Structure 1
């Protein structure tokens, strides 16, 4: 099988600029007839892949001139100039030269914007949940940029890195910010043994620590 490797994984550009996505092969994708059947697809969230470039460097129907593909042997590039908002999504390369046909990992094209500190809210467990023998402490970190941020949990001043589940949203298409929820799962009995619950967002780097606490 021909292994396609794409790099980078994510790539933030300012709208109007140029982007370069690379796609490497673990062996030749020249077919017996001498032709290279490399294709680039774009996939937007919720929708299915749309064919952009076929056969290394041919624009498909209704694909704007700003997309151009090139490359030689095991190395293939997709350059996107004048990046518009509708160009944002995931870019896969594909080879139709040898069975099985394989895809690359993909590369996320995201948009750059101005730095924004998160809005942080911490929630105690609901009394409903306590009647079930569980206690989930929840923390929302909303509308920040960039994607990377460090969330710290503290219970009675002591750091907790244990049963913590974090989930990010996709880049918000209206304002280009990211959001995150961070959940601390405890038993009801563990919860009652402790008073102070704190959720820390940190950027260093940026806007100094944002702490949010509750007690009882």
Structure 2
């Protein structure tokens, strides 16, 4: 009955920098008898159940390292990571446990940050097997590109294609924080007999000039 809000959604900071996450409640969740704010902070790692991190919005559970601190009052609460490390990339949830039902936070994803990189492009045409079924699929592969501010445009006979493509972005590579984007175009046999020049053109911030990869039909 008392919805919460978090901010920011996705934050990128470098190793050893501070990290501030803000939780805002509709109404004050302060218990008069004990004068303790009722609000908790949770950490979830990909593929595991969440773990308690802070309860009463000021006290730390046993074993939690000092780095994690919780502050705030009234309706505004914040979680501050004094210095981020290589193990803290995760999703953080703020939950109020004053009166049932217990609402949860949207969730904040904390990821690290690296210097700009340039993506070596690839292009794969459909095989002989794809043709027989009746649905050809061409794919273009960006690799090892930071950051995710980019855009792939397909090129057929100097005419843009829209509404016939999908995009699969992978999660951050653990060892070095580089992504990898696969853009795929699904077209029937008729749209394959269409022309002669199939190309992938990539625009990325770090790369000064949009790149072009074309393969001739033959």
Answer yes or no: same fold by TM over 0.5.
Answer: yes
3-state SS of 1:15 partner: coil
Alpha carbons 1:56, 1:69 under 8 Å: kept: yes
Alpha carbons 2:150, 2:205 under 8 Å: kept: no
CA distance in 2, matches of 1:84, 1:207: 32
Q: 1:116 to 1:126 in 2, by over 3 A?
A: same
Q: Which 5+ residue runs of structure 2 have no aligned equivalent? A: none
Counterpart residue number, 2:24:
24
CA distance in 2, matches of 1:212, 1:27: 56
TM-score by length of 1: 0.94
Q: Map 1:65-214 to 2 at 5 A.
A: 65-204=66-205, 206-214=207-215
Deviation at 1:32, TM superposition (A): 6.1
Q: Map 1:50-61 to 2 at 5 A.
A: 50-61=51-62
**Rg bigger for which structure?**
2
Deviation at 1:63, TM superposition (A): 0.9
CA distance in 2, matches of 1:74, 1:167: 39
Aligned-pair Cα RMSD in Å: 1.5
Deviation at 1:181, TM superposition (A): 0.9
Deviation at 1:208, TM superposition (A): 2.4
3-state SS of 2:30 partner: coil
Q: Which 5+ residue runs of structure 1 have no aligned equivalent? A: none
Which consecutive segments of 4 or more residues in structure 1 shift more than 6 A? none
Deviation at 1:36, TM superposition (A): 2.4
3-state SS of 1:190 partner: helix
Alpha carbons 1:31, 1:98 under 8 Å: kept: no
